Scaffold this active site. Structure first.
Site, PDB file in Angstrom:
ATOM      1  CB  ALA A  69      -1.285   5.113   0.252  1.00  0.00           C
ATOM      2  CB  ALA A  70      -4.436   7.251  -2.994  1.00  0.00           C
TER       3      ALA A  70
ATOM      4  CB  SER B 101     -12.581  -0.158   7.765  1.00  0.00           C
ATOM      5  OG  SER B 101     -11.039  -0.058   6.794  1.00  0.00           O
ATOM      6  NE  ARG B 102     -10.261   5.595  14.113  1.00  0.00           N
ATOM      7  CZ  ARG B 102      -9.161   5.425  15.020  1.00  0.00           C
ATOM      8  NH1 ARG B 102      -8.653   4.599  15.414  1.00  0.00           N
ATOM      9  NH2 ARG B 102      -8.666   6.717  15.478  1.00  0.00           N
TER      10      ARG B 102
ATOM     11  NE  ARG C 238     -22.290   2.111   6.322  1.00  0.00           N
ATOM     12  CZ  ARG C 238     -23.568   1.679   6.638  1.00  0.00           C
ATOM     13  NH1 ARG C 238     -23.708   0.209   7.025  1.00  0.00           N
ATOM     14  NH2 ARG C 238     -24.513   2.524   6.442  1.00  0.00           N
TER      15      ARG C 238
ATOM     16  CG  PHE D 151      -8.228   0.775  -4.713  1.00  0.00           C
ATOM     17  CD1 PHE D 151      -7.074   1.757  -5.251  1.00  0.00           C
ATOM     18  CD2 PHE D 151      -7.829  -0.439  -4.244  1.00  0.00           C
ATOM     19  CE1 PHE D 151      -5.863   1.125  -5.231  1.00  0.00           C
ATOM     20  CE2 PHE D 151      -6.817  -0.942  -4.462  1.00  0.00           C
ATOM     21  CZ  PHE D 151      -5.712  -0.142  -5.008  1.00  0.00           C
TER      22      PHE D 151
ATOM     23  CG  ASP E 249      -2.064  -0.718   1.063  1.00  0.00           C
ATOM     24  OD1 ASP E 249      -2.271  -1.505   0.299  1.00  0.00           O
ATOM     25  OD2 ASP E 249      -3.098  -0.626   1.954  1.00  0.00           O
TER      26      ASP E 249
ATOM     27  CG  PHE F  31     -18.334   0.128  -5.171  1.00  0.00           C
ATOM     28  CD1 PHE F  31     -17.537   1.316  -4.803  1.00  0.00           C
ATOM     29  CD2 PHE F  31     -17.566  -0.861  -5.420  1.00  0.00           C
ATOM     30  CE1 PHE F  31     -16.254   1.047  -4.134  1.00  0.00           C
ATOM     31  CE2 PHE F  31     -16.473  -1.242  -4.951  1.00  0.00           C
ATOM     32  CZ  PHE F  31     -15.692  -0.258  -4.744  1.00  0.00           C
TER      33      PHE F  31
HETATM   34  O1  LIG Z   1     -19.189  -0.741   2.684  1.00  0.00           O
HETATM   35  C1  LIG Z   1     -18.052  -0.765   1.975  1.00  0.00           C
HETATM   36  C2  LIG Z   1     -16.834  -0.643   2.719  1.00  0.00           C
HETATM   37  C3  LIG Z   1     -15.886  -0.555   1.781  1.00  0.00           C
HETATM   38  N1  LIG Z   1     -15.698  -0.411   0.596  1.00  0.00           N
HETATM   39  C4  LIG Z   1     -14.764  -0.532  -0.461  1.00  0.00           C
HETATM   40  O2  LIG Z   1     -13.703  -1.346   0.000  1.00  0.00           O
HETATM   41  C5  LIG Z   1     -12.504  -0.823  -0.094  1.00  0.00           C
HETATM   42  C6  LIG Z   1     -11.593  -0.883   1.161  1.00  0.00           C
HETATM   43  O3  LIG Z   1     -12.250   0.156   1.997  1.00  0.00           O
HETATM   44  P1  LIG Z   1     -11.576   0.593   3.381  1.00  0.00           P
HETATM   45  O4  LIG Z   1     -12.608   1.787   3.854  1.00  0.00           O
HETATM   46  O5  LIG Z   1     -12.002  -0.693   4.103  1.00  0.00           O
HETATM   47  O6  LIG Z   1     -10.322   1.052   3.037  1.00  0.00           O
HETATM   48  P2  LIG Z   1      -9.604   1.972   2.229  1.00  0.00           P
HETATM   49  O7  LIG Z   1      -8.938   1.223   1.136  1.00  0.00           O
HETATM   50  O8  LIG Z   1     -10.467   3.211   1.838  1.00  0.00           O
HETATM   51  O9  LIG Z   1      -8.291   2.547   3.229  1.00  0.00           O
HETATM   52  C7  LIG Z   1     -12.733   0.496  -0.773  1.00  0.00           C
HETATM   53  O10 LIG Z   1     -12.210   0.504  -2.215  1.00  0.00           O
HETATM   54  C8  LIG Z   1     -14.198   0.724  -0.541  1.00  0.00           C
HETATM   55  O11 LIG Z   1     -14.440   1.744  -1.600  1.00  0.00           O
HETATM   56  C9  LIG Z   1     -17.099  -0.667  -0.143  1.00  0.00           C
HETATM   57  O12 LIG Z   1     -17.283  -0.621  -1.344  1.00  0.00           O
HETATM   58  N2  LIG Z   1     -18.279  -0.895   0.808  1.00  0.00           N
END
Ligand SMILES: O=c1ccn([C@@H]2O[C@H](COP(=O)(O)OP(=O)(O)O)[C@@H](O)[C@H]2O)c(=O)[nH]1
Lengths: 39, 365
Positions: free
Chosen positions: B253-254, B190-191, B188, B256, B110, B237
């Protein structure tokens, strides 16, 4: 480490962070470092 | 109070739009120039001295070694993230027939690896999906455009297939037009970063303004990771598209997440300006999305949402431009051509002869 945060374990697998890398636990039926392979 | 706020933002909007030039002369971007600024800048620090075999050997420890040798692909036996390697190889493989020899240190982690506050042990070149100015890493289009993104309940094989996702979100955006979308802020996730905390805490205080809750990721440790609330369910999505105001944050990092939000035709609020993917340079604040500084306060969130809620046409205009930008300039073809162009310009920097390495495994094609 924080490798498990991005959910590197596929197909229902669970993850454990080491200091170096990470490791996946894969459910019966899936294999590979990231549980990506069929058993 | 509300008036000073309005003037500032409208001022920033008008200024941004008046200075805005499209990323390519025609919308088809036939010569793959839309994101060329980024690949130029990333490769520039090597332009004069070039890349010694020693530099390649020095950097091998920061990623996965790929070798194009005589139109075949070779790689370290050990990919740290195999599904990510699969994603990358989807793009490398069709280009290997029409491409010269080269060594590529491709970091699949990452976080980027070459801290320009260290050096010159961090001299590179190393390829990473995401960086800030602090890093020398060269950005490449992330694996997840094909495969190996985060695995979730709704996407157990990893978020991938951006080709398919584009069509699915295009259909869903058409189905839930602007006036139909809920007038609430939505998130929605994660932390993965505490930059995300204030939005979640605001949501809990005022669910009628913001619907934002923490999911659980695979790195979960304590209930602190959801700020002591039960882990929420994943939301698809396409279900993001029923909200007008969609929030994006950096993670490790960034994230997705960002690209997906635009294809909802909702207004995107992008928090922070540091963490990049290759295509962010051409996404322009106020033109394609609403920028917010890192660590927004609950009061900032209240003010900005209040403003756009009372300035709907302006909201829909920005949303529409962001949609159009991702639709037109983040196609599969843009991904494929960026890859091609980056590798072609990079190989020119090598000041040594690429020779086989027996320990590497053959990938394809
Ligand atoms: O309810 C959710 C939670 C996460 N995601 C997708 O799962 C990936 C991981 O999201 P998370 O917030 O866990 O971590 P991030 O990659 O944003 O640090 C990202 O592409 C989110 O757009 C999603 O589509 N629905």
């Amino acid at each position: 480490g924080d490798q498990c945060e991005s959910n590197p374990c596929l197909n229902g697998g669970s993850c454990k962070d080491d200091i170096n890398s990470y490791e996946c636990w894969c459910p019966f039926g899936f294999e590979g470092k990231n549980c990506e392979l069929l058993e | 109070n509300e008036d000073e706020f309005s003037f500032k933002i409208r001022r920033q909007i008008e200024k941004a739009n008046a200075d805005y030039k499209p990323c390519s002369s025609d919308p088809q971007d036939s010569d793959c120039s839309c994101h060329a600024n980024v690949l130029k800048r990333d490769l520039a620090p090597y332009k004069s001295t070039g890349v010694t075999r020693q530099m390649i050997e020095s950097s091998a420890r920061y990623g996965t070694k790929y070798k194009i040798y005589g139109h075949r692909l070779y790689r370290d036996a050990n990919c740290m993230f195999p599904a990510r390697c699969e994603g990358i190889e989807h793009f490398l493989l069709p280009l290997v027939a029409t491409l010269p020899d080269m060594d590529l240190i491709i970091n699949t982690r990452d976080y980027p690896q070459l801290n320009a506050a260290w050096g010159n042990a961090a001299g590179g070149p190393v390829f990473s999906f995401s960086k800030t100015k602090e890093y020398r890493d060269i950005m490449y289009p992330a694996w997840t455009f094909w495969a190996g993104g985060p695995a979730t309940k709704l996407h157990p094989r990893g978020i991938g297939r951006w080709d398919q996702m584009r069509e699915k979100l295009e259909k869903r955006a058409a189905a839930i037009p602007w006036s139909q979308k809920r007038s609430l802020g939505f998130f929605r996730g994660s932390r993965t970063s505490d930059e995300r905390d204030s939005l979640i805490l605001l949501s809990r205080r005022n669910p009628e303004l913001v619907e934002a809750q923490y999911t659980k990721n695979q790195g979960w440790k304590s209930p602190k990771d959801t700020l002591d609330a039960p882990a929420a369910d994943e939301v698809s999505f396409e279900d993001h598209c029923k909200y007008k105001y969609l929030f994006n944050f950096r993670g490790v990092a960034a994230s997705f997440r960002l690209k997906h939000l635009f294809l909802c035709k909702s207004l995107v609020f992008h928090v922070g300006d540091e963490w990049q993917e290759f295509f962010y340079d051409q996404l322009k604040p106020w033109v394609h999305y609403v920028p917010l500084k890192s660590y927004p306060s609950q009061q900032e969130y209240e003010h900005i949402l209040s403003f756009f809620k009372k300035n709907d046409a302006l909201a829909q205009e920005i949303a529409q431009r962001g949609y159009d930008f991702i639709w037109e300039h983040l196609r599969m073809k843009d991904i494929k051509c960026y890859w091609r162009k980056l590798l072609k310009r990079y190989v020119k920097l090598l000041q040594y002869e690429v020779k086989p390495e027996d320990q590497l495994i053959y990938i394809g094609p």
